[PDB]
Structure 1
């Protein structure tokens, strides 16, 4: 699958730079602007409309919605509106939610991991029944969540950092698990992951050795294979992404806002 690159931007209350930041993302060659779903962050679909008004080619995605925050019928209303009024530029990533304090602040039941995944399941089923036109992404590494992505999603997002970094070998197993559940639909589902850190260096080997301090359970060799880290020159990072597309199927790669400019040269090469 051809590469698509995203940057996860945080639209921040009290800061006046949103439209400028979105323009910088598009001008730097990103294909997707991704926004999160948190209390204390701007509301995601409203922020995405503001981004759409100042950009022309990028897709806009949630990354990912906290399913506890959304009534499925009203979310379907939001998605149809975002789709029609942007001319088809909106995608919806969904997940279970994970910050308990936000559940408590909003007056919502934290429940159990099982009830939070069931809410995601119920919402995905309802959105598909309502035939929402926005492509749907499902994120998260749990068995049930990957099973729901296999059933319902256009894009599956694998998490590489739980932060505890997951090894390439554990990611091999998660991708294979997803593929087995997807069965005949596997070829129809785009695979995404978020790179947490983009570390520009002329000595990737010395860099990985120093990073063992923050990841003691890993060898330097494992660190250089972590899907959530990109280390080296732009050319080395492009080669790494080519290898990881072959290994994991990852063609939709997102980075964090702080690394927007660091990663842009890799887009130039790929």
Structure 2
């Protein structure tokens, strides 16, 4: 599938640069602006509308909603509105949620891993029954979550890290091979209709990839330097090397929808220039 590039921007209360940041993303060649769903961050659909008002080309996506924060019928109303009032520019990524303190602050039941995944399942089923027009993305690497992506999603987002719900660890390329294969087996005949996304956490410009990876073992001691050089959540080297890496990873994993974090917006833009 043709590449599409996203930048995960954090609309921040008290910071007056939202419109300028969204314009920079579009001017830098990104195809998607992605926004998160967290307490203490601006409300995602309202921020996406504010982005739509100052951009013309980019798609706007939630990346990803905390399913515990949304009533499915009311979310369906939001999605239809966002779709119609932007001219079809909105996509909705969904997840189970994972920050327990935020559930507690909002007065919501943390429950169990099972109830949190079931809430995502129930929401996805409802959104499809209500025939929402926004493309749907599902994010997360748990078995049940990838099964839901395979059943319901237009895009599956493969995480690239794990944590203990209630600390972050990057997964290896080999673990990622297995998660993509699991998804594909669950998707069956629908595999070819689901776009594959991943989020790159760090985009590290360097003229010495090997020395950089060796140094980075300090922050990820559970990995070798060779594993660090193959980690799907990291891009290391020159822009030409990073472009070649993304071509190789599209072949290996099927990743054609690549997002980066806001801090690396400018660092990654040269790669967009080379892949287009």
Superimposed CA distance per residue, residues 165-216 of structure 1 (whole angstroms, 9 cap, x where no aligned partner): 1000000000000000000000000000000000000000000000000111
CA–CA distance in structure 2, aligned partners of residues 213 and 150 of structure 1: 36
CA–CA distance in structure 2, aligned partners of residues 31 and 154 of structure 1: 17
CA–CA distance in structure 2, aligned partners of residues 98 and 8 of structure 1: 18
CA–CA distance in structure 2, aligned partners of residues 42 and 96 of structure 1: 19
CA–CA distance in structure 2, aligned partners of residues 49 and 217 of structure 1: 42
**What's the secondary structure of 2:6's corresponding residue?**
strand
**What's the secondary structure of 1:199's corresponding residue?**
strand
Deviation at 1:163, TM superposition (A): 1.8
Given candidates 228, 236, 242, the residue that maps to 2:241 is: 236
Deviation at 1:268, TM superposition (A): 0.1
CA–CA distance in structure 1, aligned partners of residues 98 and 7 of structure 2: 21
1:11-22 aligned within 5 A: 11-22=11-22
Which stretches in structure 2 are left out of the alignment for 5+ residues?
Answer: 162-166
**What's the secondary structure of 1:213's corresponding residue?**
coil
CA–CA distance in structure 1, aligned partners of residues 9 and 246 of structure 2: 21
Superimposed CA distance per residue, residues 134-186 of structure 1 (whole angstroms, 9 cap, x where no aligned partner): 00000000000000000000000001127201000000000000000000000
**What's the secondary structure of 1:238's corresponding residue?**
helix
CA–CA distance in structure 2, aligned partners of residues 50 and 217 of structure 1: 42
CA–CA distance in structure 2, aligned partners of residues 163 and 229 of structure 1: 14
Superimposed CA distance per residue, residues 215-254 of structure 1 (whole angstroms, 9 cap, x where no aligned partner): 1111100000000000000000000000000000000000
Deviation at 1:103, TM superposition (A): 0.1
2:150 aligns with 150
Superimposed CA distance per residue, residues 70-98 of structure 1 (whole angstroms, 9 cap, x where no aligned partner): 00000000000000000000000000001
**What's the secondary structure of 1:214's corresponding residue?**
coil
Superimposed CA distance per residue, residues 90-127 of structure 1 (whole angstroms, 9 cap, x where no aligned partner): 00000000100000000000000000000000000000
Superimposed CA distance per residue, residues 30-51 of structure 1 (whole angstroms, 9 cap, x where no aligned partner): 0000000000000000000000
CA–CA distance in structure 1, aligned partners of residues 145 and 94 of structure 2: 10
CA–CA distance in structure 2, aligned partners of residues 46 and 164 of structure 1: 32
CA–CA distance in structure 2, aligned partners of residues 107 and 251 of structure 1: 38
CA–CA distance in structure 1, aligned partners of residues 111 and 222 of structure 2: 31
Q: What's the TM-score, normalizing by structure 2?
A: 0.97
CA–CA distance in structure 2, aligned partners of residues 163 and 25 of structure 1: 27
**What's the secondary structure of 1:39's corresponding residue?**
coil
Computed over aligned residues only, the root mean square deviation of the Cα atoms, in angstroms, reads 0.5
